[PDB]
Amino acid sequence: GETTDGVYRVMTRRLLGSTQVGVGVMQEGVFHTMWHVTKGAALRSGEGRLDPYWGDVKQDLVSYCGPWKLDAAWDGLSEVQLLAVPPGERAKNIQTLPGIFKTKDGDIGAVALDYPAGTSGSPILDKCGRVIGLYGNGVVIKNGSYVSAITQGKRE
């Protein structure tokens, strides 16, 4: 199948029409997405099959064909770009300065950008173009607007 680096839509036919359920990053031969998108289910890429290799429901992450490959981190200062990929709509960089999830276990980057749930898995970029995490897991604040963590996996 397509194993080219870049961002991808995750599609199902199990509902009405073809439905985008999420997004993911192919890098170094590995497809990275959020767990809630595929539930660890296998994926088709041409005839090509992708099989889950690593996953953690608590991190809400999963990798296919290999171990988690993305080790770049928000530096805590600089702005970043959600490379959002919405259902039925073209890939589109949105630049933003992350807020903060303060948790008992530490501070996480967060991005206050509101997009349909099908955007879950869309990557988040530093200025050198490195992926520093994935959008689509977080929280609804007073307003009614969605705020997402910058969710990053650990590389070996």
Binding site: V57, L83, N93, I100, K102, K127, N137, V139
Partner: protein
């Protein structure tokens, strides 16, 4: 049976639509990987 289709390159695009605020939030992460507002 899910499948994947390419949607673009991963690049920083100079002069992109700059928006969204930068809120600081106290949150709890459960064993189910659901985040929640700790107030």
């Amino acid at each position: 049976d899910m499948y994947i289709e390419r949607a673009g390159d991963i690049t920083w695009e100079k002069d992109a639509e700059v928006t969204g605020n930068s809120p600081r939030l106290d949150v709890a992460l459960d064993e189910s990987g659901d985040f929640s507002l700790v107030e």
